[PDB]
Write a protein that binds this DNA or RNA. Structure first.
Lengths: 72, 95, 162, 81, 83, 73, 82, 92, 80
RNA sequence: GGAUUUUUGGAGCAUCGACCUGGUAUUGCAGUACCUCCAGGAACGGUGC
């Protein structure tokens, strides 16, 4: 078994990619993840349609905006 | 009470909204994305647990197609934004 | 007794049998229709039964109106600026009027969205070729005096008065 | 007098059996994430290992790996194996 | 507690009502049982599928998340809860 | 947090319509307080004439809009 | 406060989320932004989809309508209680 | 026969739609009195028949005495009094 | 602290509430509740690519509002 | 008052309603999704992709 909350707590510092529901993605080191599924990453790169678009640095994504979050 | 307020202060200082706590510490401008593809860059005066922000001297830019779309922007003195439309909040913008 | 906004505000406005908002104004004997703009375009049918209106004129700009009931009146002349005030008029009830000449129905062809008409119990219908002249004047009307238009009647209307 | 099959018990059985299940997206019938469900949560959020998102229009499946699907985007989870 | 439109929807059970779905489908039928969360269970429902094609379905159940509107019959207009 | 009245639809072949034009049919095996249904012998019907068998499906309450019972219930 | 109860039983028009407007006598309300509109009429605007076509609004009366708060956007007063 | 508030009309044309027939019945009965309700059923048991509920019996009597054998939609309609009372007339 | 208490302490202020579906109502906000229900009087509402109409009273819900715009003569330190 | 049913966001085709012409049987008492069928024309409109 693997609950999503220890999976999000153990993914702190590792480079993860959070894909939103609008097709965009943010790849960066996960820094903060609370119980309300709020993500906060540092040195994040925002990509659109599989191609890198920009570098936002520190970013904060809510729970109802990120569709999925995978490891990279 | 006092313990719940201390827990809320700890969750605001060390949680996901700690970058928002950077907006009220050194008064730095943050860029928040909306649901209507309108990015608002500005300082955040007040925040909450439901991501409701109070922006002061904010600039809202978006893309409107008339051809090629133009970058029509506006400047608001004081504004309030609910947390339901907030998609992504960047602490340190590029420009 | 003249018609004003106090008689329209105190009238009973409800839902009619045709699933539309109608305001009852029966038993008023208003000699002239005026100050009807207080409804704020919140009605679709206006009843004017048992009235002493000599001329159907003085109507404000109402886009939500779709039915006019001017039955049981003494309207001898008809107004010309009726199409610019009611662009969405569909039903016109001009029964029991004092129309004698055929020229009174010439502004009545100004309404393009008009489909229902009622000119029964009138002296204008007693003359010859009245329905043919009404079909040749307003071709958009589909129901005239509770009767549908005919193709032979339309051909006789297009053939006559050439 | 009858027994009801709870969805949480079915999700726990699919996580214990390590079967490859495919979950669709909310208001999006094209993209579907298929993978081995490792575990679930109370808010219907699943954790998948070696999961891949396949599109119904382009007929292409791109691998993502160990992903975390939220409960607000999950519509229907069908057992593929 | 219970709301007054919720009580009006619960008192409208047994009569011919018409629920509206989020996709534009309007289903008119006899409301057998209702819930506090706008769950409409209707028999002899007439689905439209947002195109006018009204098909006759039996024992339909629409949830409150997609229920946009609920046209009640005019027999419940004199209810004492609405006053 | 009251559960829906899905006792009459239990162990009966019905057909639900998900969001986005999706529709499936099967036998309801249980109920949830969050309107989540479990469908056995699930056959999902796409816009084409073909139907895909699923075996056992779990549908959430946020996507289910309507469900018509194909049996007497 | 009781600002929502001050406009009760009056001819109010509530704007829906899909663009339609339901005008009726809102007699009952609740905390979940629900409305019970007696003799309600829903008007929905149709797209012209042409260069010379105008924009029309189809209106249909339904009677007593129970509108939930998930579809209601804003409500405005239109007419006094008859 | 006893005079009632509801007046029935038969021997009409059933080829027209229900909404157009209801609009024609509302336009034709507006001169006699205030039409409270128009029951227009097009089923196999009551095809081509309609009913109009009036507020007073005098308007129904005037509509029965004036529209006796009136041509509507190319057919001579027969207007008479209803055998039973109306629902809104009995409730109010 | 929640931001609903700061919005509830506002009366006779000419604000502009921009809704979610391209609607923007500018008017004097007369009432605010804990559920972010904004009741305003004598407002002007402009929809998406439509003419700005004027209404005597309006009541916008909390979930339908997207953003708010306050005047410059409004201190935020005393309202928080 | 932030975790699926209300409030801190999923953001050329099919169908239906009409318009106009002829034959056809029902003359009948009721509170309504829609009600007889066939053939011919259409240069009418809404919704989803």
């Amino acid at each position: 078994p693997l609950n999503p909350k220890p999976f999000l707590n153990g993914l702190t510092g590792k480079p993860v990619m959070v894909k939103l529901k609008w097709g965009m993605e943010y790849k960066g080191y996960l820094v903060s993840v609370d119980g309300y599924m709020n993500m906060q990453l540092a040195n994040t790169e925002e990509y659109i349609d599989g191609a890198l678009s920009g570098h936002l640095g520190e970013v904060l994504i809510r729970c109802n905006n990120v569709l999925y979050i995978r490891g990279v | 009470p006092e313990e719940l307020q201390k827990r809320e202060e700890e969750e605001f200082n060390t949680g996901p909204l700690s970058v928002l706590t950077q907006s009220v510490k050194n008064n730095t401008q943050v860029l928040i994305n909306c649901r209507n593809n309108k990015k608002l860059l500005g300082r955040v005066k007040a925040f909450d647990r439901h991501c409701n922000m109070v922006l002061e001297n904010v600039k809202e830019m978006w893309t409107e197609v008339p051809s090629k779309p133009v970058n029509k922007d506006r400047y608001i003195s004081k504004m309030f934004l609910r947390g339901d439309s907030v998609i992504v909040v960047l602490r340190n913008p590029l420009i | 007794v003249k018609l004003t906004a106090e008689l329209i505000e105190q009238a009973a406005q409800y839902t009619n049998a045709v699933r539309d908002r109608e305001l009852d104004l029966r038993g008023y004997k208003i000699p002239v229709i005026e100050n009807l703009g207080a409804t704020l375009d919140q009605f679709d049918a206006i009843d004017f039964s048992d009235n002493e209106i000599r001329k159907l004129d003085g109507f404000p700009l109402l886009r939500r109106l779709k039915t006019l009931l001017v039955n049981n009146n003494r309207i001898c002349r008809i107004g010309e600026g009726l199409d610019q005030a009611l662009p969405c008029l569909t039903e016109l009830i001009l029964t029991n009027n004092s129309l004698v000449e055929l020229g009174d129905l010439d502004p009545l062809a100004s309404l393009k969205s008009l489909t229902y008409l009622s000119i029964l119990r009138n002296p204008v219908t007693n003359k010859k070729h009245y329905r043919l002249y009404v079909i040749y004047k307003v071709p958009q009307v589909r129901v005239l005096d509770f009767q549908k238009v005919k193709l032979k009647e339309r051909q006789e209307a297009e053939k006559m008065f050439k | 007098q009858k027994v009801m099959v709870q969805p949480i018990n079915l999700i726990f059985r699919y996580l214990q059996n390590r079967s490859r299940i495919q979950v669709w997206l909310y208001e999006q019938v094209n993209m579907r994430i298929e993978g081995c469900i490792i575990g679930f949560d109370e808010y219907m959020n699943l954790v998948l290992d070696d999961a891949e998102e396949i599109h119904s229009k382009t007929k292409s499946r791109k691998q993502l790996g160990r992903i975390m699907l939220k409960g607000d985007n999950i519509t229907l989870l069908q057992s593929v194996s | 507690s219970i709301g007054v439109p919720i009580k009006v929807l619960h008192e409208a059970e047994g009569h011919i009502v018409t629920c509206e779905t989020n996709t534009g489908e309007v289903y008119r039928g006899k409301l057998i049982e209702a819930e506090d969360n706008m769950n409409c269970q209707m028999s002899n429902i007439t689905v439209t599928y947002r195109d006018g094609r009204v098909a006759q379905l039996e024992q339909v159940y629409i949830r409150g998340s997609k229920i946009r509107f609920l046209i009640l019959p005019d027999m419940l207009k004199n209810a004492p809860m609405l006053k | 947090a009251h559960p829906p009245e899905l006792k009459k639809f239990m162990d009966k072949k019905l057909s639900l319509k998900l969001n986005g034009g999706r529709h499936v049919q099967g036998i309801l095996r249980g109920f949830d307080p969050f309107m989540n249904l479990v469908i056995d012998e699930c056959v999902e019907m796409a816009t084409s004439g073909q139907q895909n068998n699923i075996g056992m499906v779990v549908i959430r309450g946020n996507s289910i809009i309507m469900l018509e019972a194909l049996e007497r219930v | 406060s009781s600002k929502m109860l001050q406009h009760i039983d009056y001819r109010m028009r509530c704007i829906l989320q899909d663009g339609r407007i339901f005008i009726g006598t809102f007699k009952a309300f609740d905390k979940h932004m629900n409305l019970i509109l007696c003799d309600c009429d829903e008007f929905r605007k149709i797209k012209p989809k042409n260069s010379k076509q105008a924009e029309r609004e189809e209106k249909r009366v339904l009677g007593l309508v129970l509108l939930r708060g998930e579809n209601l956007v804003s409500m405005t007063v239109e007419g006094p209680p008859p | 026969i006893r005079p009632n508030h509801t007046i029935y009309i038969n021997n009409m044309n059933d080829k027209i739609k229900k909404e157009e027939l209801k609009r024609s019945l509302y336009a034709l009965f507006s001169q006699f009195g205030h039409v409270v309700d128009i029951v227009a059923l097009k089923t196999m048991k009551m095809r081509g028949q309609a009913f109009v509920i009036f507020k007073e019996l005098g308007s129904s009597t005037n509509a029965l005495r004036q529209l006796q054998g009136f041509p509507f939609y190319g057919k001579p309609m027969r207007i008479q009094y209803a055998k039973t009372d109306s629902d809104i007339i009995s409730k109010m | 602290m929640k931001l609903v208490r700061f919005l509830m302490k506002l009366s006779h202020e000419t604000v502009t509430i921009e809704l979610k579906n391209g609607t923007q109502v500018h008017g004097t906000i007369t009432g605010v509740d804990v559920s972010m229900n904004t009741h305003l009087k004598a407002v002007k509402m402009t929809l998406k690519n439509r003419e700005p109409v004027q209404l005597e009273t309006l009541s916008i819900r909390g979930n339908n509002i997207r953003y708010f715009i306050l005047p410059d003569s409004l201190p935020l330190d005393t309202l928080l």
